[PDB]
Design an enzyme around this catalytic site. Structure first.
Site, short mmCIF file in Angstrom:
data_model
loop_
_atom_site.label_atom_id
_atom_site.label_comp_id
_atom_site.label_asym_id
_atom_site.label_seq_id
_atom_site.Cartn_x
_atom_site.Cartn_y
_atom_site.Cartn_z
N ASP A 26 45.89 38.41 32.83
CA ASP A 26 46.57 38.91 34.03
C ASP A 26 48.06 38.52 34.05
O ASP A 26 48.46 37.70 34.86
CB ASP A 26 45.82 38.41 35.28
CG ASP A 26 46.35 39.01 36.57
OD1 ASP A 26 47.04 40.08 36.55
OD2 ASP A 26 46.06 38.38 37.62
N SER A 68 41.26 34.90 40.49
CA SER A 68 40.26 35.20 39.47
C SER A 68 39.41 33.98 39.04
O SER A 68 38.18 34.12 38.88
CB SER A 68 40.90 35.95 38.27
OG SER A 68 41.79 35.09 37.59
N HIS A 75 40.11 42.38 40.58
CA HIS A 75 39.04 41.42 40.84
C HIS A 75 37.66 42.06 40.94
O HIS A 75 36.69 41.47 40.50
CB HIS A 75 39.36 40.58 42.07
CG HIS A 75 40.51 39.62 41.86
ND1 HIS A 75 41.34 39.22 42.88
CD2 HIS A 75 40.95 38.98 40.74
CE1 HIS A 75 42.23 38.36 42.41
NE2 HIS A 75 42.02 38.21 41.12
N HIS A 121 46.36 33.58 32.32
CA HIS A 121 47.32 33.38 33.42
C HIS A 121 46.50 33.10 34.69
O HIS A 121 46.29 34.03 35.52
CB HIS A 121 48.17 34.64 33.68
CG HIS A 121 49.01 35.12 32.53
ND1 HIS A 121 48.48 35.82 31.46
CD2 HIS A 121 50.35 35.06 32.32
CE1 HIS A 121 49.46 36.14 30.62
NE2 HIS A 121 50.60 35.69 31.11
N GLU A 162 47.42 27.80 32.79
CA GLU A 162 48.50 28.10 33.71
C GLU A 162 49.78 27.40 33.28
O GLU A 162 49.80 26.18 33.13
CB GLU A 162 48.12 27.73 35.17
CG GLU A 162 49.29 27.87 36.19
CD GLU A 162 49.96 29.26 36.17
OE1 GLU A 162 49.26 30.31 36.02
OE2 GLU A 162 51.21 29.30 36.31
N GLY A 214 49.08 30.37 28.15
CA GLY A 214 47.78 31.01 27.83
C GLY A 214 47.80 32.04 26.72
O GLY A 214 46.89 32.13 25.93
#
Length: 267
Positions: free
Chosen positions: A153, A89, A11, A34, A107, A133
């Site tokens: 991610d 995020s 992050h 993600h 998602e 994604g």
């Protein structure tokens, strides 16, 4: 695992990338493959955050200024000085991006997706999608904005993700070779990670790899993690070195380590 050591480095990395790219007054496409649920309640019914964000947060008044944007978001989401929530995020991105930009958040899990629909947008332009994604990379790039940050991610709960992911980035890169690609990866099985990294290396030499290693004396679970960035910003390698040095003073100090390696066409 919200707010664990991997979240912290991932992050802060995201915040530095966002801080750089928003220097240009032209719209940015921001794509997450993600996105998860977007915000994490640290008090609902293992407290991994105690060893990630918590030491960093508790010592926040002593952090180098490179930590400012990261800390300010954690401050914002929480009602007071006690850590109750950790942002995902998407919550960082919505804070640093501008009204002219376009956020596209993906998602796959229905519960997680339903929570992500509840994130504040402020005055930003936020598209939340219940979709694979990784499959979306192909459809959405190159974006009309012609400027993109693609933040990847994965969970790597399937071994096959270690080959699916670089395959998808390679395809995306072929269509949009000037995009800024940032993919997080774990170090759980060195061999799998090294195979992932060999595929990432083939895509582009304008790359930087950063890793943070806890170096526990038992190699069980995730002992470290990293990010691979294609087209990293001007000055990012030296900023991220300061960040990683600082983090090794909080995570297993005296034993933890980091590395930074740039591609043949990067400095």
């Amino acid at each position: 695992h919200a707010g664990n050591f991997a979240d912290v480095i991932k992050h802060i990395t995201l915040t530095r990338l966002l801080a750089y790219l928003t220097h240009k007054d032209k719209p940015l496409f921001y794509l997450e493959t993600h996105s998860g649920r977007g915000i994490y309640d640290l008090k609902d019914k293992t407290e991994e955050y105690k060893e990630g964000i918590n030491p960093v947060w508790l010592d926040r008044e002593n952090l180098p200024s490179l930590f400012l944007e990261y800390i300010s978001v954690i401050k914002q989401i929480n009602l007071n000085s006690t850590l109750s929530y950790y942002p995902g995020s998407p919550y960082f991105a919505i804070n640093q991006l501008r009204s002219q930009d376009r956020l596209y958040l993906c998602e796959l899990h229905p519960t997680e997706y339903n929570f992500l629909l509840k994130l504040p947008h402020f005055n930003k332009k936020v598209y939340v999608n219940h979709t694979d994604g990784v499959s979306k990379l192909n459809a959405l790039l190159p974006p009309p904005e012609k400027r993109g940050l693609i933040f990847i991610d994965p969970s790597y709960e399937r071994k096959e993700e270690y080959k699916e992911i670089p395959y998808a980035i390679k395809n995306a890169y072929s269509k949009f070779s000037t995009g800024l690609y940032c993919v997080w990866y774990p170090v759980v099985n060195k061999a799998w990670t090294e195979q992932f990294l060999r595929k990432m290396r083939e895509i582009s030499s304008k790359s930087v790899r950063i890793e943070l290693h806890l170096n526990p004396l038992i190699n069980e679970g995730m002992t470290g993690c990293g990010l691979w960035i294609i087209n990293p910003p001007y000055t990012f390698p030296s900023e991220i070195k300061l960040v990683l040095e600082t983090l090794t003073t909080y995570f297993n100090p005296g034993s933890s380590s980091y590395m930074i390696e740039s591609g043949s066409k990067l400095c």
